[PDB]
Amino acid sequence: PEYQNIFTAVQVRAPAYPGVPLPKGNLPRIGRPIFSYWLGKIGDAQIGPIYLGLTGTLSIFFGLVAISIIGFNMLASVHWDVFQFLKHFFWLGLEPPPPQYGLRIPPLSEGGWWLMAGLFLTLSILLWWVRTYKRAEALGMSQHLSWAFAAAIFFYLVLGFIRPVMMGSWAKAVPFGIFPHLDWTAAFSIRYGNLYYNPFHMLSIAFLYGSALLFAMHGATILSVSRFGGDREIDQITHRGTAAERAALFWRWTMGFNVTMESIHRWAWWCAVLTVITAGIGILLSGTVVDNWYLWAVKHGMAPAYPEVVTAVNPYETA
Amino acid sequence: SAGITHYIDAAQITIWAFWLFFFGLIIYLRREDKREGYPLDSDRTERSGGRVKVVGFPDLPDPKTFVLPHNGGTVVAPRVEAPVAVNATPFSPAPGSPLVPNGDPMLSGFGPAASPDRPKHCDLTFEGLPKIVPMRVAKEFSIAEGDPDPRGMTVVGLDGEVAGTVSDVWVDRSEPQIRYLEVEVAANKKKVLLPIGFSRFDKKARKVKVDAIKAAHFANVPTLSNPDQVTLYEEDKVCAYYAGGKLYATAERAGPLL
Amino acid sequence: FTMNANLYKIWLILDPRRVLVSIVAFQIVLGLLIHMIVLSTDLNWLDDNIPVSYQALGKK
Amino acid sequence: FTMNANLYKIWLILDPRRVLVSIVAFQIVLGLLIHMIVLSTDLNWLDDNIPVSYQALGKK
Amino acid sequence: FTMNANLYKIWLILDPRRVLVSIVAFQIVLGLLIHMIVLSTDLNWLDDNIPVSYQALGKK
Amino acid sequence: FTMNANLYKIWLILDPRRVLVSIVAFQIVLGLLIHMIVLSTDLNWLDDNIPVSYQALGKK
Amino acid sequence: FTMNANLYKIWLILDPRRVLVSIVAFQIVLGLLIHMIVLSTDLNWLDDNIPVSYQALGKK
Amino acid sequence: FTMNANLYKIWLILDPRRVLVSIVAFQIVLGLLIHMIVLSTDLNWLDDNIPVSYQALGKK
Amino acid sequence: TGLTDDEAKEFHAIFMQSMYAWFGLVVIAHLLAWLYRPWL
Amino acid sequence: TGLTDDEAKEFHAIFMQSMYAWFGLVVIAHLLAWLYRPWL
Amino acid sequence: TGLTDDEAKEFHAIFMQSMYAWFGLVVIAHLLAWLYRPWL
Amino acid sequence: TGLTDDEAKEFHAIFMQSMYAWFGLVVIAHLLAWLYRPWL
Amino acid sequence: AMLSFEKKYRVRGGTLIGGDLFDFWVGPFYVGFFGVVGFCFTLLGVLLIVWGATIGPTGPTSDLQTYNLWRISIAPPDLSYGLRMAPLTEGGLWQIITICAAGAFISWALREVEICRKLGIGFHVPFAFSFAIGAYLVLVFVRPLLMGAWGHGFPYGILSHLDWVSNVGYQFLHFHYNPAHMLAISFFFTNCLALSMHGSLILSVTNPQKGEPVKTSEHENTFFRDIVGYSIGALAIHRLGLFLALSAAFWSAVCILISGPFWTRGWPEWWNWWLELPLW
């Protein structure tokens, strides 16, 4: 346990905290809290209780159907031979409906199960979003999490709702497969002229990167200032403290400007939530609005120019 | 992004739609980034930026209103805070130059040892009891089954010499954890609190190593008003004292290495 | 409802509100599911066969 | 109508507020999802048959 | 009836809340994991043999 | 249970509850696991020979 | 058996409950493992050969 | 117990409890790893040659 | 738990009526279904 | 656990009759299908 | 632990027995199994 | 550590011995193996 | 110009090299030894990067030489020179400029170091920033070195360094199958999943519903305990994050390094070791 506020050297335990009182109508928490010395050596040790109401139960049950369907077909292709199942797991996956069905409901064989397990996974998330909304207002909390989770969901549906349907073919939808879905994103790009030139795709990376960047700063800074109680952000947001009182000066002296203990968390939010925002878009545009982002770039004089040390002929025009 | 445009299409009709929202959001943020600190104090080096300006690109925002919980006051952001005090003299009449700590920098309360006057009250839990308290009050808290007990270990010091021995540790009701250590200085025989952040463990020799300040410095550590609860005011002024050591506990530290 | 007699005792050990929500939800999926698993196979009644093709008399 | 005399009590164990707005949504999606399913595949009341003129005299 | 002799003492170490709940789950999933896999199997009933293809007849 | 007589001792260190429940699970999965594994390559009464005819004959 | 004349001392440093539960699993896994690996290439009595070919005899 | 005279001292610095269980994990893993690396290439006794294709030859 | 035999029993019938209500509402669903397009 | 011998034996009994309730309703289930579509 | 020698045997005996009920139950299962489709 | 010279010797003896028990077990298989497909 | 609470922190000392000399503040920034250093690299490179836009692929009069930020590019020398300095024109610029990158990045960290040394804060930030720099030291030094050619580096072109990422990527076919690459990716995603979660919660407890007080850590814990059960902890997240962030980069560094020096075949194929396992 090296102390750079990395691992809690000495842990202590108190009676299982059954969460704070909820409002009327909200079922009582369930689950006997557990304690883990190891886990707790990372952060908190106590576990649960967990809430589970209508939306919750309706969700945990819903999406649990999709997962089954998927894992089922997977173990199905392997001819129910677990041996080869745990072998080709990565490869195994529930493929979408063939283009010879458009959007029509295909038979369980040719793409059916996918669609089904899809809607069950589509609503499973939409429903889960409400589940979170019910956990916010029940605690007088705001909906910053729902707003974000929403954004993510946006891009999630772009991969099936808004784009595929806008294309008129369930073929342009990601498959239920660890590896095969990697090929999806692998093919999509190839199909649309290289996402490197797709504007939104870049903007989105700036976030996948920025995101990682900030937390690398914040998560760190808070620790570096964890000495002066820099982890207790809440009472810091209310009445500024010494932690946040030097915590900024650092950044200020280093990069010139800075933000407040609260402020930053707002940047982080928009630097992360905006990630998928530029995600669903960059994909909502591809296939529909644009078809070849390479020529699209050069069309606007984007694509860089390189000398010609290597070039190939074209047997088509020739022959 | 080109100065002149000869091509028009939907893809690009949405891109700019973003940058506008972006150029706007970045401002929204900036505004918030000024709810603590500004306005500035001097003019050592005339605000630098592509476009100077009086106080940044975005005008200061409107004071937000924070309703603390029960039995609490109210906070506003931003707020007009009265000027602080500097117990240091300018190393040079030239702007920007640092300020040398007067007297013993270990307690000059400047820079590393310098801490703002936090509310001379105490943080509480959801119900209303002082959040951070000593185990001598936390009748429920016990050392994790297995993890070695701190209560009884001898708190060593920077120079190595022993400064005292732990008599108790302060746990946190709100967030189960150990935040402070009720250390019993040998010199003054007083009882000062020790922050986790500076508290290091050596379960082998039953000690709580500290590179912050020397064993002798543990003597005049910002005392606490009520030994049954730590005040936010003092709490922040506490662990700040140790910080000084991080840069004053030895002339060599502040001194260059090369 | 004959066996209902002895079955009444269950309420004393399990929270009634649970078996209700767990089931009101359990049926939700099952229903949305069946019409689905069925409409996708045995008979896609909506637009697979009868009635009068919305494509034939439709598209034309 | 038989069990009708004994179901009003359903309001002593299930808070109304939550059961109302919850379903208000329950249905919102459901129906918003029906037109959905029916429109994509079953039949396309707008583009399928009539009025044939809009796009027959439109696409031309 | 044979084993039912001393098997009552079981509930004395195994809570009923446990069994009741897990049992439902197992028997639920387990069951669905049968019509399911078996369905996908030859003896399918929805669209395998009979009702003999009427879709083909009625549709067109 | 012949030599199992002396084994009585096992209970003090092999917690009852745990041993029973846990073990009850191991089989649950295995039971299916096996049936699945055998059902895979050896012989598949579900899709191998008869009395299955409705599947193939009934289809075409 | 002799070599074990002093082997008793083991239950003094090692934790019985642990050494037990551990092996409880190790052989549990070692076992399912082997059957698995052997049944893979060596002799796959399932789909490998006779007694009968319910599949090659019954299928065809 | 030849070297048991001079090397006894080893246990005073080496915590008996750690090295014992630690080494245990090793060898068993080394063993399972070896069989693995060997059975795979050198000769896959399970699948490689004799006794005989009882399986492939015996079946078909 | 958290209830006695009295309040419990009552719940058993009241909901039971609505329960079979399902077995009935869905039995009429099938019986009229099997009538329309016989399955199997 | 959480109970004594008394409450224990009572549960087990009713709990059984409820289990044979299944086996019978399921065995009769299998059989009805067994007659219709013969597996194996 | 948490238990003593006296009930150590009682839990021991009740559980051991049942275990053999399944061993006989399933051995029989593998019996009708071999009867139907012989394997190996 | 956590002991002395005397007690340390005791463990060294029981441990060491039973160890050969293994090498003895290993070699015999290495050799019963080398009997079969003498690798190389 | 200082913040309402800046003056009382601008202490003298805590310098690594020649501090007293440059020990001062220029506006909201700090200089010191490393302060001047980085600058000496900034303009010496930033301008060279411009000189590249000026000059161009072949010449300043060429038709290739452009100023479009998108088309701008500063590619390294051929793989012929390997570990040799190529003509400033034919790869020289990149080579030199890059040497300025390390001088800027590293110094920038070192500068942060003593900066923290003054605030008596933790050296987390810099140590964290190290990884980023380290990752760079891999995409230009480590990798190229084990490849025997400074030409293996990536072009300094806003969009130009994307192609270098496409080729080197496909150079191993479907670059999506890289173990380290995948792993790393997960982290980048987890991280973003963390931010979207952390930042959100804070704002959701310090700015609750209308007519509501500022929630406490008492809620935070319950909140995530009612949606998924467990709550990592206050600083825990600030730990977890820092972890993900670094881990994301670390595993990535490995990701590209292994690609080439430690593997020439196609990544998709590497996974075969799992297949050719005597178990299936």
Ligand code: BCL
């Ligand atoms: C990591 C693997 C590849 C790589 C793959 C990608 C991919 C894939 C993408 C980028 C993208 C970007 N990359 Mg790159 N990039 C690499 C290494 C670098 C290095 C480097 C020093 O090593 C730099 C400076 C950049 C810089 C950049 C930005 C121009 C652009 C925005 C990213 C972002 O938002 O991050 C988060 C951080 C911030 C927003 C804050 C700071 C970043 C600023 C905005 C960028 C300034 C760069 C500037 C033009 C350099 C000259 C400065 C002079 C003083 C003028 N890349 C390596 C070789 N890079 C994205 C893009 O759109 O490219 C066109 C994109 O999609």
Ligand code: BCL
């Ligand atoms: C492949 C060739 C055959 C075939 C050959 C076999 C063989 C051979 C066997 C089975 C067995 C089983 N088969 Mg079959 N089976 C076939 C086709 C099928 C089909 C089908 C749809 O086609 C189905 C659905 C099944 C279904 C089943 C299961 C009913 C049964 C597995 C029980 C179990 O896992 O207990 C798991 C165990 C436990 C949960 C707990 C342990 C049991 C203890 C003793 C009792 C519990 C005590 C407890 C502590 C007290 C509290 C009580 C409650 C838990 C609250 N078979 C084909 C035709 N089948 C097995 C069987 O019947 O065993 C009797 C078996 O050996």
Ligand code: BCL
């Ligand atoms: C390759 C050609 C041969 C072959 C050649 C060899 C060779 C050569 C060797 C083996 C060995 C082994 N083979 Mg072989 N083997 C073949 C085919 C097989 C097949 C098979 C399915 O086909 C199997 C399952 C095995 C299985 C095995 C293992 C039994 C054994 C490795 C044990 C081990 O790693 O312990 C791991 C170790 C430990 C857990 C602990 C260390 C032991 C100590 C001394 C005892 C523990 C002390 C403890 C502190 C006291 C507490 C007691 C309890 C732990 C509580 N072989 C083919 C036919 N096999 C090895 C062997 O058996 O040597 C004797 C060996 O050297």
Ligand code: BCL
């Ligand atoms: C598959 C072949 C047939 C067909 C066969 C069947 C069969 C067979 C059945 C249905 C059933 C349904 N069908 Mg149909 N159906 C077909 C085509 C359709 C089409 C279509 C567009 O083509 C549509 C829109 C529907 C629509 C529907 C739904 C109205 C209904 C789903 C009920 C349900 O499970 O709720 C899920 C359940 C619940 C939410 C809870 C359970 C209800 C309880 C008893 C009441 C709640 C009590 C509560 C605690 C008290 C408070 C009340 C309020 C919450 C305040 N069918 C085709 C033609 N359909 C089911 C039905 O409606 O039976 C009556 C049914 O059994």
Ligand code: BCL
């Ligand atoms: C065909 C193309 C291949 C491919 C080929 C490659 C190749 C080739 C590489 C990667 C690399 C990476 N790829 Mg890949 N990749 C593909 C598809 C993907 C997908 C996807 C969803 O499809 C994802 C998420 C990723 C993700 C990633 C990252 C894990 C990794 C970049 C790591 C990093 O953190 O560098 C962290 C950052 C840096 C090195 C830059 C250092 C930052 C410096 C110190 C700061 C700059 C400051 C600046 C000067 C100031 C700006 C301010 C201005 C003054 C205003 N790839 C496809 C399949 N990928 C790279 C990698 O593995 O790197 C290890 C790599 O080399």
Ligand SMILES: CC[C@H]1c2cc3[nH]c4c(c3C)C(=O)[C@H](C(=O)OC)c4c3nc(cc4[nH]c(cc(n2)[C@@H]1C)c(C(C)=O)c4C)[C@@H](C)[C@@H]3CCC(=O)OC/C=C(\C)CCC[C@H](C)CCC[C@H](C)CCCC(C)C
């Ligand atoms: C695991 C580490 C994560 C991380 C952490 C991190 N980054 C950091 C820090 C930390 C802790 C800082 O403290 C520092 C910072 O912002 O301090 C205020 C920083 C920083 N992270 C930055 C960028 C950055 N980080 C990235 C990634 C990450 N940063 C990781 C997720 C990425 C990418 C590619 O995803 C980028 C682009 C900077 C904003 C900043 C460091 C700024 C700095 O020190 O700049 C020094 C140099 C100059 C200003 C002048 C450069 C001119 C040279 C003479 C020429 C060099 C040429 C260059 C190589 C060409 C680039 C061309 C491209 C456009 C193709």
Ligand SMILES: CC(C)=CCC/C(C)=C/CC/C(C)=C/CC/C(C)=C/CC/C(C)=C/CC/C(C)=C/CC/C(C)=C/CC/C(C)=C/CC1=C(C)C(=O)c2ccccc2C1=O
């Ligand atoms: C074509 C054309 C017409 C051109 C015109 C050109 C013209 C006019 C030019 C003149 C203008 C000029 C020259 C401008 C130069 C401006 C320059 C050089 C600025 C240099 C500064 C610089 C490189 C800054 C980099 C900043 C970056 C990229 C940061 C990335 C991370 C990020 C999103 C930061 C924003 C939010 C902040 C400040 C986070 C830091 C931060 C973190 C991370 C905490 O954890 C924390 C905890 C508690 C309190 C505060 C903080 C805190 O501030």
Ligand SMILES: COC(C)(C)C/C=C/C(C)=C/C=C/C(C)=C/C=C/C(C)=C/C=C/C=C(C)/C=C/C=C(C)/C=C/C=C(C)/C=C/CC(C)(C)OC
């Ligand atoms: C009165 O007493 C009271 C009641 C008070 C208290 C307590 C009573 C107790 C505690 C009674 C306990 C009874 C017990 C504990 C009986 C236990 C017997 C056990 C646990 C026996 C376990 C033996 C396990 C052994 C010997 C395992 C050996 C495994 C080996 C050698 C494995 C080798 C594996 C290899 C080489 C695998 C290779 C993998 C492949 C083949 C894939 O490699 C190619």
Ligand SMILES: COC(C)(C)C/C=C/C(C)=C/C=C/C(C)=C/C=C/C(C)=C/C=C/C=C(C)/C=C/C=C(C)/C=C/C=C(C)/C=C/CC(C)(C)OC
């Ligand atoms: C003082 O207060 C007093 C005590 C008076 C109480 C007042 C009480 C009141 C008002 C109480 C009201 C209670 C009510 C109204 C309760 C109503 C309850 C109902 C209607 C319950 C209905 C239950 C229905 C059940 C449990 C149905 C179960 C169906 C099952 C298990 C179906 C299984 C389906 C399967 C396995 C389907 C599989 C599909 C395939 C085969 C495809 O899977 C592969």
Ligand SMILES: COC(C)(C)C/C=C/C(C)=C/C=C/C(C)=C/C=C/C(C)=C/C=C/C=C(C)/C=C/C=C(C)/C=C/C=C(C)/C=C/CC(C)(C)OC
């Ligand atoms: C007042 O106090 C009172 C009277 C209440 C005390 C109460 C006492 C009570 C309630 C006592 C009750 C005791 C009971 C009921 C005990 C029950 C014991 C049971 C049911 C044991 C069941 C055991 C089932 C077993 C052991 C199955 C074992 C299967 C094994 C180990 C299979 C191994 C399989 C392998 C390795 C398979 C490999 C498959 C391949 C290798 C082919 O996969 C590739």
Ligand SMILES: COC(C)(C)C/C=C/C(C)=C/C=C/C(C)=C/C=C/C(C)=C/C=C\C=C(C)\C=C\C=C(C)\C=C\C=C(C)\C=C\CC(C)(C)OC
């Ligand atoms: C047998 O299984 C057991 C019981 C052992 C359980 C084990 C299960 C396991 C191991 C499951 C493993 C699952 C895995 C590995 C899944 C991996 C999934 C991956 C990698 C997915 C990747 C991407 C998926 C995407 C992008 C999915 C998008 C889905 C969409 C957009 C669905 C949209 C659905 C819609 C719009 C439905 C609309 C309703 C209709 C069709 C009616 O509207 C007309």
Ligand SMILES: [Ca+2]
């Ligand atoms: Ca595919």
Ligand SMILES: [Ca+2]
């Ligand atoms: Ca049929």
Ligand SMILES: [Ca+2]
């Ligand atoms: Ca058959």
Ligand SMILES: [Ca+2]
């Ligand atoms: Ca066979």
Ligand SMILES: [Ca+2]
């Ligand atoms: Ca050889």
